[PDB]
């Protein structure tokens, strides 16, 4: 189906001493493929997926040069924003930026993004049309005026519809053995007595990719949300994901209850029974 | 492939 490339950048000022801590990460879908950490020894953009290591020294030199320039931009932004919000030099503050593109089912450009936050709140974001800006407050309005004058949206639209998509496709081919492979959830159910009249049924989904999944309970063929608990989808640590949902049921009535699993790796949804 | 240049706020 659809695929995405996204970069995530976080800079955190350190008023006591020295420059902000800057961390950049790159993803294709739910797979991290590169990282930069200003406090790491290498001072280079580093590979985090086997399939990106195929790229030659020119790639790595270019991404390092760009990511270092990104770092310096965020450093300046922390100063700029402290001024706009009339804050002191004493406290630590955070800037975050995310950008990237999606390709659709036809493998062509679908959507582009470029958004920014200061201290965890929306600051400025490129609209879906990739032509205008959403500014949250009067500080961001100043940035909007600057960015409109400098035609930043135009530069971004060119990258998002061009280079971004092109390289996303390149990565998808080079990493196809994993990036274009779906791992269906491995599912099972457990049973636990909570009293002599009640039991918990837990429906597990393990080792799946991508992270997107739906797990639901039904009772006699109708959706059941009461007396259920559903954990947030979590990383296994080997590139796959995990999730479970549980329901409390009257002892001896377990047969009424069915767990329903929807995932890209499953041709038809799965139904589990105790 | 990172954007060639990021704009400062």
């Amino acid at each position: 189906g659809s695929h995405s490339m996204r970069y995530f950048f976080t800079s955190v000022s350190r008023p006591g001493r020295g420059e902000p801590r800057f961390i950049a990460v790159g993803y294709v879908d739910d797979t991290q493929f590169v990282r930069f950490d200003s406090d790491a020894a290498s001072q280079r953009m580093e590979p985090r997926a086997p399939w990106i290591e195929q790229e030659g020294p020119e790639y790595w030199d270019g991404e390092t040069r760009k990511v270092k320039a990104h770092s310096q931009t965020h450093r300046v932004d922390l100063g700029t924003l402290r001024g706009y919000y009339n804050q002191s030099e004493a406290g630590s503050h955070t800037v975050q930026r995310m950008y990237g593109c999606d390709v659709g089912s036809d493998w062509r450009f679908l959507r582009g993004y470029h958004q920014y936050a200061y201290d965890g709140k929306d600051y400025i974001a490129l609209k879906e049309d990739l032509r205008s800006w959403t500014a949250a407050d009067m500080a961001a309005q100043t940035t909007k005026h600057k960015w409109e004058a400098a035609h930043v949206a135009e530069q971004l639209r060119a990258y998002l519809e061009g280079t971004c998509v092109e390289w996303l496709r390149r990565y998808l081919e080079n990493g196809k053995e994993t990036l274009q492979r779906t791992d269906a959830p491995k599912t099972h159910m457990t049973h636990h007595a909570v009293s002599d009249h009640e039991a918990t049924l837990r429906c597990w989904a393990l080792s799946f990719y991508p992270a997107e999944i739906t797990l639901t309970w039904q009772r006699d063929g109708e959706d059941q949300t009461q007396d259920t608990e559903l954990v947030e989808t979590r990383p296994a640590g080997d590139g796959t994901f995990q999730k479970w949902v549980a329901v409390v049921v009257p002892s001896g009535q377990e047969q009424r209850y069915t767990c329903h699993v929807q995932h890209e790796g499953l041709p038809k949804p799965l139904t589990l029974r105790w | 492939n990172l954007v060639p240049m990021v704009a400062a706020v």
């Binding site: 995530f8 976080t10 955190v12 961390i23 990460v25 993803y27 991290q32 990282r35 950490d37 985090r48 630590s92 955070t94 975050q96 995310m98 936050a117 201290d119 965890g120 709140k121 929306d122 457990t190 636990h192 837990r202 393990l206 954990v231 947030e232 979590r234 990383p235 296994a236 640590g237 080997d238 995990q242 479970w244 | -």
Partner: protein
């Protein structure tokens, strides 16, 4: 300053079976700011070799990290994750439950 407290899950990478090598995970998410202290504990004691994922964030800007260490579960040994953050008065301890 918006401040969001971390959600915490402690779990194993693979189905847990006594005497079989595995990984213990502590997944922290939904927090802001990004500064956080996460330790994995064996029988109340801090484990030394613990690694973590590179800092990233979700759509709502909140951060997430996976902390993990190689372990072999036994009948006796107890495991937990200990988390401190600016939003927390004291460290929060979440015990590893095999069923969850």
């Amino acid at each position: 300053m918006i401040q969001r407290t971390p959600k915490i899950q402690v779990y194993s990478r693979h189905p847990a079976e006594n005497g079989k090598s595995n990984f213990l995970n502590c997944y922290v998410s939904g927090f802001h700011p990004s500064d956080i202290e996460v330790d994995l504990l064996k029988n109340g004691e801090r484990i030394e070799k613990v690694e973590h994922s590179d800092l990233s964030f979700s759509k709502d800007w909140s951060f997430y990290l996976l902390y993990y260490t190689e372990f072999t579960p036994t009948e006796k040994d107890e495991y937990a994750c200990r988390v401190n953050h600016v939003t927390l008065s004291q460290p929060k301890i979440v015990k590893w439950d095999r069923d969850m």
